[PDB]
Design a protein around this ligand. Structure first.
Ligand SMILES: COC(=O)[C@@]1(O)C[C@H]2O[C@]1(C)n1c3ccccc3c3c4c(c5c6ccccc6n2c5c31)C(=O)NC4
Length: 301
C-alpha cells in the first residue's frame, strides 16, 4: 500500500541514468504474451523502436528510494557490460509508483539447457563445444570487469536466433528460474545449486573468478551430456571424486574440465586460457559426430 514519490531520487543519479532510460513512446509491452514468470515478477514479449523484438522483465513494485537508487546504479553499470556472449541491457523504465521494467533482448531458443535437452535438436560435438567456447568468451569478458557471476550454469545462458550464446542471470537480468533454484548470491538460500559450486565456495563462502571457472567446468559437462543433471556434495567431492567423462566428450575437453575443478583455486585456468584451449579443440572437429543422451541419465532429476 506504500506510496513512493520518485522526485525524492538524487537529481545527480537521475541525470546519470538518463542514457539507460527507454521512454514510453519507444516501448510497447505485449501484456497478452507472457514469456515466463517467477517470484521476481513477469517477463513479457515487447517491441522496442529506433522495431526490435525484446523481452520485458517487469519487477514487483519498489517502494523504497534506496532500493530504487540501487536499481538505477546497477542499470548504469550493466549498460556498459557489452559483449556478443553476454546478455545486454537494452534499457530500463521506472513508471509511476516504483514499477520497474528491464528491457532485454529476446532469445528465440530460450535457455541453453532446455535447448540441448530437446530430443528434436541434433547437435554435434562441434556444436556443443562451440557453445562452451562462446560461454568462455562471455566469462572472459565478465572477469575482465572484475565481475564474479556465481550463477553460471547451462540454464542461465540463453541462445538467440543466430545460435549465439549469451551468458545471462546476472545484474538486472537476474532471477532466472527462481522457483527451481535460489541464486548463489543468496547467503541463506534453501535451494542453492550446490552441484555447480566450487569446493571452497561450499566450505568457506569464497566466491571468485576461479570459483566461476569451477562452475564453467560443470557447464561444459552439462553441454556434453546434453543437459543431464550434474552428479546424477561436499562430502562426495572430498572422497576424491569428480563428474565422469561424458560418452561423447573428447579426451582433451575432459582434461580441461578436470583443470577447472583443480583443488587449488589458483591453479585453475583463467577464462582467457579456457578460450584459447577450447578454441583449439573446437577447430579440430567438422560436425560429423552426433551427440545423444546417456541412457542412465535420461529422465533423471
Ligand atoms: C519459468 O521461466 C523462467 O524462470 C525464465 O528464467 C525462463 C523464461 O522466462 C524466465 C522467467 N526468464 C527470465 C527471468 C529473469 C530475467 C530474464 C528472463 C528471461 C529472458 C528471456 C526468456 C525466454 C525466451 C524464450 C523462452 C523462455 C524464456 N524465458 C526467458 C526469461 C529472453 O528471451 N530474454 C530474457
Amino acid at each position: 500500500t506504500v506510496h513512493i514519490d520518485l522526485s525524492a531520487l538524487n537529481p545527480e543519479l537521475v541525470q546519470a541514468v538518463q542514457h539507460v532510460v527507454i521512454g514510453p513512446s519507444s516501448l510497447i509491452v505485449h501484456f497478452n504474451e507472457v514469456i515466463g514468470r517467477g517470484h521476481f515478477g513477469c517477463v513479457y514479449h515487447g517491441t522496442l523502436l529506433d522495431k526490435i523484438h525484446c523481452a520485458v522483465k517487469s519487477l514487483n513494485r519498489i517502494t523504497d528510494i534506496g532500493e530504487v537508487s540501487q536499481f538505477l546504479t546497477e542499470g548504469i553499470i550493466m549498460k556498459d557490460f557489452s559483449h556478443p556472449n553476454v546478455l545486454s541491457l537494452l534499457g530500463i523504465c521506472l513508471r509511476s509508483e516504483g514499477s520497474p521494467l528491464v528491457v532485454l533482448p529476446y532469445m528465440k531458443h530460450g535457455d541453453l539447457r532446455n535447448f540441448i535437452r530437446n530430443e528434436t535438436h541434433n547437435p554435434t560435438v562441434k556444436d556443443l563445444i562451440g557453445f562452451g567456447l562462446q560461454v568462455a568468451k562471455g566469462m572472459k569478458f565478465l572477469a575482465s570487469k572484475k565481475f564474479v557471476h556465481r550463477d553460471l550454469a547451462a540454464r542461465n545462458c540463453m541462445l538467440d536466433e543466430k545460435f549465439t550464446v549469451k551468458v545471462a542471470d546476472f545484474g538486472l537480468a537476474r532471477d532466472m528460474y527462481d522457483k527451481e533454484f535460489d541464486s548463489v548470491h543468496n547467503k541463506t538460500g534453501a535451494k542453492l545449486p550446490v552441484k555447480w559450486m566450487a569446493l571452497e565456495s561450499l566450505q568457506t563462502q569464497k566466491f571468485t573468478t576461479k570459483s566461476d571457472v569451477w562452475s564453467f567446468g560443470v557447464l561444459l559437462w552439462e553441454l556434453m551430456t546434453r543437459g543431464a543433471p550434474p552428479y546424477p556434495i561436499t562430502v562426495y567431492l572430498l572422497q576424491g571424486r569428480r563428474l565422469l567423462q561424458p560418452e561423447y566428450c573428447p579426451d582433451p575437453l575432459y582434461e580441461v574440465m578436470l583443470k577447472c575443478w583443480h583443488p587449488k583455486a589458483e591453479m585453475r585456468p583463467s577464462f582467457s586460457e579456457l578460450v584459447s584451449r577450447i578454441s583449439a579443440i573446437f577447430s579440430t572437429f567438422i560436425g560429423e559426430h552426433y551427440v545423444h543422451v546417456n541412457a542412465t541419465y535420461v529422465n533423471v532429476k
